[PDB]
């Protein structure tokens, strides 16, 4: 109909743009559900530059396989947020999305106006939260449990055995991170690779770790007990804001305007050297300084001639993460100066790696801020396997915040069917055919998992649609017999968080997809 | 070669067919938009986006033309919105099918001035008609207000979570009322910021009596946590600065370099010791902040924070109470920021942000949306602005008129008495400008879905009846329904400028009658 | 894969090509699902050379319709196997190939392996086959049956008023057809149309009618009483297989080979017009010659001296149709003519129109031939209500040939869906599940046609899905109030052959369709 108003313009129409959108969404679950389940097999990305993905967690598929549908950006944008918001799932959201507008086709293709099937999942997303909030299991923060939610989370993505060497490293971490009120996830979590030796042997280290190394030979590349400099002020030489450039008439004030030149930088190093002077008496401590800016070559003679260890250019919020492991006070002004300022380590020293150098912060007495330095073997397997460190870390995150947890592999997902299935129509009965849909969307989950473990889709859901007695239990799937399984018991869980927003983000979303008619391109050449 | 060499033209009938053609069109590709039962729009952006909306604004705003009425009715559409937020659902169908009876009396070889000045007399009879059948209504009743809400929402996407977006309205419009023009205080619309962060539900949205700054603690050390903060608004930078004059320097002794170096150190000093004075706790700039200013500050435990939004930082003062200050040795008192309940700084995730609430008596505030996805947010956003504007309406004007077409067929009627009281060639487009009004309740009535033609003779038949003129069209039963007790309310501004812009589209429109091309200029 | 093997070759690949064939199928279901039905809409196709078409009958739809997905070429291709057998239903077929297929991917969308669905398929359709074969109502050749099978098949396509007056003509002619034993539908069936005065005024003429007329003036226009001669000899002059230029001397022997040369046909002509004198020696009666060859001018001379109607070059079966009508003899050599070899008409003339020339005959004694002559006020027109005509003619054909008739309006469908339905997995379990999805897609019919008819679909359904007791009749859809119908009562049928037919092509074609996994495309250049 635009045509007339625009030649070069498109559009579709009702029916017509209904089926792009169903279609599109379609075939991105399609694309997708080879992910999810631990036995799910991980993708392979290459960049038209020639780089190399190896992951598993769908938002970076759908961030970086590039794709035209208008719905499937929209989709891409939606998991996008739930990935910043809790980390895996975002597999499981495309999935629930792709095949509630399946189920959504069946019946409006039956005639059924849109709008009816959407009163339909309102109703039954209020009925299924309501569900989903009573059968949270409330459980305290025990080591076991984050373990197992870490080991839960983690198998998603690389081998068994990779995961279980991992899961101990993060539970450690968040264990040593919290101050019993709140974790913010960045100061405390450094996430640093290093190209080195394995997969397997990357570990937490209870400091600090550095991307930067020592810019002078006396250096010394170790020290046994260390005293950290936290600062940032420059070290390096400046010149004033304001056109200073001087006239002098000797060539002996000339090499007077350098030293006075010089002088300022030289007032401040020798403020340095006086504090560790008068601290560092003994001959055993060691004292380190670390700048966010440079530091001077003439500066680097000054602090190695008295054997002090400097580092220059760390990211703005190392210095954070010093004050949070060797609890020294990050400062500026060196005129107001103290011991009390000092940062103490129990070891610090440096590592050298093919050409770039690293530095390590070693025994903090009470540290709080810790990194988990990644070993890799190959330089894709860094990147998967730091997206797979960022998910546990988050979900471990939502698991301290909600005092409850959800039995894992999709029982809360057969309870959601069971449960809304079990919905006479109380709806003004019209509705109850969307709320019919809705439910046999839930199972995609087990649906899923069965089909991407390999057994037969339809005969293990029947199998596993057996509510057991008046305890009727939550029961997963198996993931390797395809047999009902107590989540609880074999310890597979999930967050809340994770399921509620699923569950209402989805539910906004296909409300709002199935009501398009027309999909219209009109814009400037 | 003669006028311009590659400019076209059209002339007559031609040209007037032509452009109601256009402006017909225009009307169709939103007639399916309209209604409670309405349908949801997506648009394809130029530069990738995706936009999906209801309003019609946006939908319109989101089309380039050639034709050069249709790029009039563009306009007309973005005033409309503008000016009252709604109704731009509704405003470019009722023109366009105004102007299709309209060209229905071209082929008359009725001149199109005469009909013109019968529009004219239609729309101050409408106007006075309106006018007459409006209903008064307390300002201060918050539930009646609420209702006024829930009825020019119940269009779009917000529908189901109605009670949450009423209240947020009222809120936010309450709130905002700048009393020093005496008893004239003007409301505006810019102080309330909405901000559209990701995750979350609709249900965790709230409205946060301050301001949201997306930006955070400079330092480690501040305290993001404060009970009673104490607010400074630095509009100037806080460190040293260009001598504007291109100034120089020539030194010759020693000292001379090392003591300048010193003297931009203490020069910042004594903005500290000018700004802790006043014991603050908070300290805001547009502008950068040197790291020792920073330094100093910390010394003293001030919390600060740099290079935000001049808006944003105009709303801050709003919200504290204090006035922005862009010299600190003239820094007052009487700009202390008193007046913040709590100073905090949380994480969303992956972002720190800044809250400021629980103000005494806050006039500023920005809503907090939290949803699904940014492009579902600025729809929920947009559906908001909606809603705010028409709750800004009202608090300029009392007065309110029942929706759901009845105020149309009430129209219609009165019209067709003036005119068979109203004799003359004119008469014939009175009346016609009368069936046109009856399309808003038919449209309604298609996309509800129920038999159109018996649905509305039932309703006009129904509204020859005088006892009763608030008999209007429920959107989803397709029944005739008395408005009082279904509740659909609008302000009467709204319905006002939606007939006056109208008619304007009309006039304009049909005193257009020859196309000319190829400007070059 | 066999993209190695060859660069611009094509192919899909298992889910890929099984969802482009649904796709496929789909699309022209939903494209064709307007016509079925009374209340359909006909639709009307424009070629590239700018003719016009305004059908409903749907193989004239996937026939001028240019589409390129081959298995809508191959459905096309069954459809116009069907018309030729049967003549409606192709709608049907199709409409019941897209939505068995639909609910086909409904199925294997869930993992099921298509074979399954295809065994399951096979066993429901042989309990459907018994059961059509069972509810077939056996009726004789009344009348007024015919009448109402014609007026059922008919209305699908034209107006009410045009069909119940077209009704009355299609079964007069097929009862003055029959040798009790044979019909053939070619010879008896004549074809015509003349872009003359009306839609409706087309009616059934008790003789013969001709398409060309009389090439001479001294022609009498009209004859009161006539004697038929059927032949095809020539009557033309012709020069003998073997080159036979001749040469002469004197001018005068020029015009004596001449009279030679003619004489031949003289003879020829002359042997005619005493059998007409010897036969006609009343003034009255008239004779009509019919040549299938041409007729020489000298020879129109001749005939027309003696006041004889003749007629040349009608197409070969118009002498079978004469043979049929007026019982003459169609004869080659005139050398053994006798008065018993002549044709008796009780009346022929000519009617004019336009340019073009007509040929009545009429009054046969025992007609065994006849002409629907079409009257159109529109090309188009008579185009469509030929494809009318035949669809009815070919849909008694079946009628009288098969004993029986099957109720229309659906109820068979129902039938089909409550049968199947009832169905234990007497089957071996997992093709119950093709059982069921197959009697789901059997109810399409009556869907299609409430649908087209504005009635809501499911609601409908559910009230003809009552079965009344004992007596659970036969109940079709009311086509203008959406209600149960008893189709017998009412009399809306169909042949059994129609729905067996459909049933067993579609069963084979949905098999057969199922059961592709990748569409290639490796041709020479």
Same mark, same amino acid.
């Given at each position: 109909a635009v045509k007339t108003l625009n030649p070069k313009a498109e559009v579709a129409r009702a029916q017509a743009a209904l089926a792009?959108?169903?279609?599109?969404?379609?075939?991105?679950?399609?694309?997708?559900?080879?992910?999810?389940?631990?036995?799910?097999?991980?993708?392979?990305?290459?960049?038209?530059?020639?780089?190399?993905?190896?992951?598993? =967690?769908?938002?970076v598929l759908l961030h970086e396989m590039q794709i035209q549908h208008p719905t499937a950006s929209l989709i891409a944008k939606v998991a996008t947020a739930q990935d910043d918001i809790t980390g895996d799932g975002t597999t499981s959201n495309v999935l629930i999305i792709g095949e509630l507008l399946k189920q959504a086709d069946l019946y409006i293709s039956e005639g059924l106006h849109p709008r009816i099937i959407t009163e339909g999942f309102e109703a039954a997303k209020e009925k299924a939260l309501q569900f989903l909030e009573e059968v949270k299991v409330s459980r305290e923060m025990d080591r076991e449990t984050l373990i197992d939610v870490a080991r839960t989370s983690l198998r998603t993505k690389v081998h068994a055995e990779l995961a279980d060497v991992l899961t101990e490293a993060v539970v450690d971490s968040i264990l040593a991170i919290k101050k019993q009120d709140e974790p913010i996830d960045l100061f405390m979590i450094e996430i640093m690779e290093m190209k080195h030796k394995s997969e397997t042997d990357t570990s937490l280290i209870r400091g600090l770790v550095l991307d930067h190394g020592a810019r002078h030979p006396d250096m010394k590349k170790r020290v046994e007990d260390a005293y950290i400099l936290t600062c940032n002020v420059s070290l390096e030489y400046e010149k004033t804001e304001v056109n200073s450039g001087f006239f002098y008439k000797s060539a002996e004030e000339r090499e007077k305007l350098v030293k006075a030149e010089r002088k300022f930088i030289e007032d401040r190093v020798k403020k340095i050297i006086e504090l560790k002077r008068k601290v560092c008496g003994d001959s055993d401590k060691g004292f380190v300084v670390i700048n966010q800016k440079g530091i001077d070559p003439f500066s680097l003679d000054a602090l190695s001639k008295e054997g002090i260890v400097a580092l220059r250019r760390a990211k703005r919020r190392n210095m954070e993460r010093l004050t949070l492991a060797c609890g020294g006070v990050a400062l500026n002004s060196f005129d107001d100066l103290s011991p009390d300022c000092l940062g103490?380590?129990?070891?610090?020293?440096?590592?050298?790696?093919?050409?770039?150098?690293?530095?390590?912060?070693?025994?903090?007495?009470?540290?709080?801020?810790?990194?988990?330095?990644?070993?890799?073997?190959?330089?894709?397997?860094?990147?998967?396997?730091?997206?797979?460190?960022?998910?546990?870390?988050?979900?471990?995150?939502?698991?301290? =915040? =909600?005092?409850?947890?959800?039995?894992?592999?999709?029982?809360?997902?057969?309870?959601?069917?069971?449960?809304?299935?079990?919905?006479?129509?109380?709806?003004?009965?019209?509705?109850?055919?969307?709320?019919?849909?809705?439910? =046999?969307?839930?199972?995609?989950?087990?649906?899923?998992?069965?089909?991407?473990?390999?057994?037969?889709?339809?005969?293990?859901?029947?199998?596993?649609?057996?509510?057991?007695?008046?305890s009727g239990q939550l029961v997963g799937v198996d993931l390797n017999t395809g047999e009902p399984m107590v989540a609880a018991e074999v310890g597979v869980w999930d967050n809340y968080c994770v399921k509620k927003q699923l569950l209402h983000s989805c539910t906004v979303i296909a409300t709002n997809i199935l009501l398009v008619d027309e999909i219209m391109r009109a814009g400037m050449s | 070669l003669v006028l311009s060499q590659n400019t076209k033209r059209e002339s007559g009938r031609k040209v007037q067919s032509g452009n109601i053609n256009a402006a017909k069109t225009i009307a169709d590709i939103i007639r399916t938009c309209l209604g409670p039962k309405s349908m949801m729009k997506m648009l394809l952006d130029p530069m990738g986006g995706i936009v999906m909306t209801n309003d019609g604004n946006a939908i319109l705003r989101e089309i380039q033309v050639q034709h050069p009425a249709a790029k009039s009715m563009i306009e007309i559409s973005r005033t409309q919105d503008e000016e009252v937020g709604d109704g731009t659902t509704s405003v470019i169908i009722l023109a366009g099918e105004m102007l299709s009876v309209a060209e229905h009396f071209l082929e008359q070889q009725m001149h199109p001035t005469v009909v013109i000045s019968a529009y004219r007399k239609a729309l101050d009879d409408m106007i006075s008609t309106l006018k007459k059948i409006s209903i008064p209504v307390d300002i201060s009743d918050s539930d009646m207000?609420?209702?006024?809400?829930?009825?020019?929402?119940?269009?779009?996407?917000?529908?189901?979570?109605?009670?949450?977006?009423?209240?947020?309205?009222?809120?936010?419009?309450?709130?905002?009322?700048?009393?020093?023009?005496?008893?004239?205080?003007?409301?505006?619309?810019?102080?309330?910021?909405?901000?559209?962060?990701?995750?979350?539900?609709?249900?965790?949205?709230?409205?946060?009596?301050?301001?949201?700054?997306?930006?955070?603690?400079?330092?480690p050390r501040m305290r993001r946590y404060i009970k009673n903060p104490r607010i400074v608004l630095l509009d100037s930078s806080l460190e040293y600065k260009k001598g504007e004059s291109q100034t120089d320097i020539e030194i010759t002794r020693e000292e001379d370099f090392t003591r300048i170096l010193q003297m931009e150190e203490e020069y910042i000093q004594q903005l500290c010791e000018d700004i802790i004075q006043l014991k603050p706790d908070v300290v805001i700039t547009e502008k950068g902040i040197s790291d020792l200013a920073q330094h100093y500050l910390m010394r003293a435990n001030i919390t600060a924070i740099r290079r935000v939004r001049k808006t944003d930082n105009n709303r801050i003062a709003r919200a504290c109470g204090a006035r922005i200050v862009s010299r600190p040795e003239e820094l007052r008192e009487d700009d202390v920021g008193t007046g913040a309940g709590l100073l905090e700084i949380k994480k969303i995730g992956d972002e720190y942000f800044t809250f400021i609430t629980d103000c005494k008596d806050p006039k500023a505030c920005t809503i907090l949306l939290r949803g699904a996805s940014k492009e579902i947010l600025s729809e929920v956003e947009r559906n908001l602005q909606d809603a705010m504007q028409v709750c800004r309406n009202v608090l300029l004007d009392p007065q309110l008129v029942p929706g759901g077409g009845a105020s149309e067929m009430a129209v219609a009627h009165a019209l067709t008495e003036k005119s068979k009281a109203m004799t003359g060639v004119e008469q014939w487009p009175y009346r016609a400008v009368a069936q046109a009004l009856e399309v808003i309740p038919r449209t309604l009535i298609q996309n509800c879905g129920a038999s159109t033609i018996r649905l509305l003779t039932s309703l006009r038949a129904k509204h020859t009846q005088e006892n009763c003129e608030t008999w209007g069209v429920n959107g989803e039963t397709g029944t005739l329904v008395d408005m009082k007790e279904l509740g659909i309310w609008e302000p009467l501004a709204v319905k006002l400028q939606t007939y006056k812009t109208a008619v304007e589209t009309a006039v304009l429109l049909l005193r257009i009658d020859d196309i000319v091309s190829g400007h070059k200029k």
């Amino acid at each position: 109909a635009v045509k007339t108003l625009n030649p070069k313009a498109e559009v579709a129409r009702a029916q017509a743009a209904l089926a792009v959108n169903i279609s599109a969404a379609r075939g991105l679950q399609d694309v997708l559900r080879t992910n999810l389940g631990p036995k799910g097999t991980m993708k392979m990305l290459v960049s038209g530059a020639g780089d190399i993905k190896l992951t598993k =967690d769908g938002n970076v598929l759908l961030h970086e396989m590039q794709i035209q549908h208008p719905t499937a950006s929209l989709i891409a944008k939606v998991a996008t947020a739930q990935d910043d918001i809790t980390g895996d799932g975002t597999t499981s959201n495309v999935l629930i999305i792709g095949e509630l507008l399946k189920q959504a086709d069946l019946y409006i293709s039956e005639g059924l106006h849109p709008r009816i099937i959407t009163e339909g999942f309102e109703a039954a997303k209020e009925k299924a939260l309501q569900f989903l909030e009573e059968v949270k299991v409330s459980r305290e923060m025990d080591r076991e449990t984050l373990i197992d939610v870490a080991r839960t989370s983690l198998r998603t993505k690389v081998h068994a055995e990779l995961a279980d060497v991992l899961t101990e490293a993060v539970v450690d971490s968040i264990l040593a991170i919290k101050k019993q009120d709140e974790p913010i996830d960045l100061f405390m979590i450094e996430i640093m690779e290093m190209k080195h030796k394995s997969e397997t042997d990357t570990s937490l280290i209870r400091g600090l770790v550095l991307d930067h190394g020592a810019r002078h030979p006396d250096m010394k590349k170790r020290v046994e007990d260390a005293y950290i400099l936290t600062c940032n002020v420059s070290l390096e030489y400046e010149k004033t804001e304001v056109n200073s450039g001087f006239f002098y008439k000797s060539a002996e004030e000339r090499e007077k305007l350098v030293k006075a030149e010089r002088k300022f930088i030289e007032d401040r190093v020798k403020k340095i050297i006086e504090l560790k002077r008068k601290v560092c008496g003994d001959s055993d401590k060691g004292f380190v300084v670390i700048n966010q800016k440079g530091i001077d070559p003439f500066s680097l003679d000054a602090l190695s001639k008295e054997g002090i260890v400097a580092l220059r250019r760390a990211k703005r919020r190392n210095m954070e993460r010093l004050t949070l492991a060797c609890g020294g006070v990050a400062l500026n002004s060196f005129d107001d100066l103290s011991p009390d300022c000092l940062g103490h380590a129990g070891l610090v020293y440096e590592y050298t790696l093919g050409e770039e150098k690293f530095t390590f912060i070693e025994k903090c007495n009470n540290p709080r801020s810790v990194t988990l330095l990644i070993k890799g073997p190959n330089k894709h397997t860094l990147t998967q396997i730091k997206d797979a460190v960022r998910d546990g870390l988050r979900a471990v995150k939502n698991a301290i =915040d =909600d005092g409850c947890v959800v039995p894992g592999a999709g029982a809360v997902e057969v309870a959601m069917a069971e449960a809304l299935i079990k919905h006479k129509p109380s709806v003004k009965g019209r509705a109850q055919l969307g709320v019919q849909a809705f439910a =046999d969307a839930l199972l995609i989950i087990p649906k899923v998992l069965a089909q991407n473990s390999g057994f037969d889709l339809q005969e293990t859901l029947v199998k596993i649609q057996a509510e057991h007695s008046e305890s009727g239990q939550l029961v997963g799937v198996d993931l390797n017999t395809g047999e009902p399984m107590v989540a609880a018991e074999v310890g597979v869980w999930d967050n809340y968080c994770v399921k509620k927003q699923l569950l209402h983000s989805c539910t906004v979303i296909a409300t709002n997809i199935l009501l398009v008619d027309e999909i219209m391109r009109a814009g400037m050449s | 070669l003669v006028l311009s060499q590659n400019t076209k033209r059209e002339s007559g009938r031609k040209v007037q067919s032509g452009n109601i053609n256009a402006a017909k069109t225009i009307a169709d590709i939103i007639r399916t938009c309209l209604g409670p039962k309405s349908m949801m729009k997506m648009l394809l952006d130029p530069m990738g986006g995706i936009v999906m909306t209801n309003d019609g604004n946006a939908i319109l705003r989101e089309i380039q033309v050639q034709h050069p009425a249709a790029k009039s009715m563009i306009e007309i559409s973005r005033t409309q919105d503008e000016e009252v937020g709604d109704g731009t659902t509704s405003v470019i169908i009722l023109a366009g099918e105004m102007l299709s009876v309209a060209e229905h009396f071209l082929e008359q070889q009725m001149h199109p001035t005469v009909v013109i000045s019968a529009y004219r007399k239609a729309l101050d009879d409408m106007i006075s008609t309106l006018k007459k059948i409006s209903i008064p209504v307390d300002i201060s009743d918050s539930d009646m207000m609420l209702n006024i809400i829930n009825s020019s929402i119940t269009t779009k996407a917000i529908s189901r979570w109605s009670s949450l977006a009423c209240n947020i309205a009222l809120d936010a419009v309450k709130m905002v009322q700048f009393e020093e023009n005496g008893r004239k205080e003007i409301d505006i619309k810019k102080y309330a910021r909405v901000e559209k962060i990701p995750g979350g539900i609709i249900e965790d949205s709230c409205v946060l009596r301050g301001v949201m700054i997306n930006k955070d603690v400079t330092h480690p050390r501040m305290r993001r946590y404060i009970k009673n903060p104490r607010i400074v608004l630095l509009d100037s930078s806080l460190e040293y600065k260009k001598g504007e004059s291109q100034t120089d320097i020539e030194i010759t002794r020693e000292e001379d370099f090392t003591r300048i170096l010193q003297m931009e150190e203490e020069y910042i000093q004594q903005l500290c010791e000018d700004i802790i004075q006043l014991k603050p706790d908070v300290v805001i700039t547009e502008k950068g902040i040197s790291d020792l200013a920073q330094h100093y500050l910390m010394r003293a435990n001030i919390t600060a924070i740099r290079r935000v939004r001049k808006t944003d930082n105009n709303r801050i003062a709003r919200a504290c109470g204090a006035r922005i200050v862009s010299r600190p040795e003239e820094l007052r008192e009487d700009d202390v920021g008193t007046g913040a309940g709590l100073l905090e700084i949380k994480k969303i995730g992956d972002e720190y942000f800044t809250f400021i609430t629980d103000c005494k008596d806050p006039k500023a505030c920005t809503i907090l949306l939290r949803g699904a996805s940014k492009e579902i947010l600025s729809e929920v956003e947009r559906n908001l602005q909606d809603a705010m504007q028409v709750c800004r309406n009202v608090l300029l004007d009392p007065q309110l008129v029942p929706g759901g077409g009845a105020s149309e067929m009430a129209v219609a009627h009165a019209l067709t008495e003036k005119s068979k009281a109203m004799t003359g060639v004119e008469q014939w487009p009175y009346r016609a400008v009368a069936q046109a009004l009856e399309v808003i309740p038919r449209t309604l009535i298609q996309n509800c879905g129920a038999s159109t033609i018996r649905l509305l003779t039932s309703l006009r038949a129904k509204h020859t009846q005088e006892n009763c003129e608030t008999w209007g069209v429920n959107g989803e039963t397709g029944t005739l329904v008395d408005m009082k007790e279904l509740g659909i309310w609008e302000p009467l501004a709204v319905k006002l400028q939606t007939y006056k812009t109208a008619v304007e589209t009309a006039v304009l429109l049909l005193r257009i009658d020859d196309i000319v091309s190829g400007h070059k200029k």
